[PDB]
């Protein structure tokens, strides 16, 4: 029924952390392989460039997610093996939330960084597949209908991170205890934002179920990339278990990003 000062300040902190993280990500825009311009050469290099472009965006996204996690109150009090385990599982899910958040229903395009705007077809030209692309856009549409503000998004991201059922979580009771305040805060926040719409909160929580499916749809996508001999960079291979060496986690790239 009411929002605690503590609760207000926590939400404020999360929202602030996301903007701080977005700013850092925009700094890296010049770092990205330019999206090919003109008519595609027969060399086939435009395809490889589009795929590399998207892959680099994904990398930045992972960095952005790690930066954010570190600023979520509680996250740094967990063991480093669990921090890793929680991010491995949730990265794709958060990526999808952040993706939906950048969807425009008028252009039916998603905007990455400041002004990298891409349609469904662009996604396909980048080397992703329709079985993956279509759910992404369906999910964005669904999210847009919900009409979430920056605070609701941030909260949902935090909750998603503190899912105790992820693989290799050594201290699951600790993760559920962390999750609970963020859940309580979201209940309070949404019930104050929209008192005349009680369904808003369950609606949101149920998106965490959708995201489990989409995580799986994404696994089917990785399988197709291997099949097409598209190699992924270490970080993404590590986090999603794709290629021999990096996929086993022998590089500790995520460990390092946390270490900083």
């Amino acid at each position: 029924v009411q929002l605690t000062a503590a609760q207000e300040l926590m939400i404020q902190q999360l929202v602030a952390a996301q903007l701080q993280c977005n700013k850092r990500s925009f700094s890296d825009q010049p770092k990205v392989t330019p999206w090919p311009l003109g008519a595609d050469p027969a060399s086939g290099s435009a395809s490889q460039q589009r795929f590399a472009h998207f892959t680099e965006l994904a990398i930045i996204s992972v960095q952005e997610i790690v930066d954010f996690a570190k600023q979520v109150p509680g996250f740094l009090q967990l063991g480093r093996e669990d921090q890793i385990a929680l991010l491995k599982a949730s990265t794709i899910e958060i990526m999808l939330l952040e993706t939906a958040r950048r969807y425009n229903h008028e252009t039916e395009c998603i905007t990455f960084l400041k002004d990298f705007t891409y349609s469904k077809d662009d996604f396909h030209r980048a080397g992703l597949q329709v079985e993956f692309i279509n759910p992404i856009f369906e999910f964005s549409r669904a999210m847009r209908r919900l009409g979430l503000d920056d605070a609701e998004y941030a909260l949902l991201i935090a909750i998603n991170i503190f899912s105790a059922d992820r693989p290799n979580v050594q201290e699951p009771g600790r993760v559920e205890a962390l999750q609970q305040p963020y859940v309580e805060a979201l209940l309070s926040y949404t019930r104050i934002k929209r008192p005349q719409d009680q369904l808003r909160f369950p609606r949101m929580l149920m998106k965490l179920v959708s995201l489990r499916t989409l995580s799986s749809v994404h696994s089917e996508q990785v399988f197709a990339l291997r099949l097409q001999d598209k190699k992924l960079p270490p970080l993404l291979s590590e986090i999603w278990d794709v290629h021999e060496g990096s996929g086993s986690g022998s590089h500790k790239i995520l460990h390092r990003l946390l270490q900083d």
């Binding site: 909160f201 369950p202 609606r203 929580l205 489990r212 499916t213």
Partner: protein, 215 residues
């Protein structure tokens, strides 16, 4: 109410090593159809849609019912066949990991919450009314029915457990766990297919029995 919690409770009550699980599955599939019919407004949907929902949900639905059934068991689950399965057996069959996830995330949580039957049925009705299932003639209709379950369930939770402010949320937060667990179990059912199976279960794993059975 538009989705009476009573009628949902009636539906659960109205329904009373590896191969043993598949035997148990095939039999429960029949019971599941009878359960789904007792859920408000389910039979009112288009026949093709009733089919689609049961094909999409049967897996999570069965896992939920046997998880709750096993609340009294210690380090094991109780199948509808009457047979038990224990950790030691599960690890012997290379299915130990998924088995431990079920106990940790479902059976345990259900026990500690003292999740009641009404609560179970509502969760199962939520799973059942899945508007993201492909090929539905009207996803909106299905979305609306799920949303009524949200409302009825929350109402129930505030009435019967007024002291438990976060109980409703606690219930819903089992569903993501259940979805992921459902995907892994399905995986194993496909391995058994590739390597002594029953008829109805086979139809569910295939990309007729179900049609007749709800007419």
């Amino acid at each position: 109410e538009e989705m009476p919690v009573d009628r949902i409770l009636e539906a659960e009550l109205a329904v009373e090593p590896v191969t043993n699980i598949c035997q148990a599955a095939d039999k429960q599939l029949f019971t599941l159809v009878e359960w789904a019919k007792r859920i408000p407004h389910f039979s009112s949907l288009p026949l093709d849609d009733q089919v689609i929902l049961l094909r999409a949900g049967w897996n999570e639905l069965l896992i939920a019912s046997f998880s709750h059934r096993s609340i009294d068991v210690r380090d094991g689950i109780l199948l509808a066949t009457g047979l038990h399965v224990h950790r030691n057996s599960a690890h012997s069959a290379g299915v130990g990991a998924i088995f431990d996830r079920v106990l940790t995330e479902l059976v345990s949580k259900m026990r500690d919450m003292r999740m009641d039957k009404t609560e179970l049925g509502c969760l199962r009705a939520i799973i059942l009314f899945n508007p993201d299932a492909k090929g539905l003639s009207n996803p909106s209709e299905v979305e609306v029915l799920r949303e009524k379950v949200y409302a009825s369930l929350e109402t129930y939770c505030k009435q019967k457990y007024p002291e438990q402010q976060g109980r409703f949320a606690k219930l819903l937060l089992r569903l993501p766990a259940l979805r992921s667990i459902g995907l892994k179990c399905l995986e194993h059912l496909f391995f058994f297919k590739l390597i002594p199976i029953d008829t109805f279960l086979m139809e569910m794993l295939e990309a007729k029995i179900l049609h007749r059975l709800l007419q």
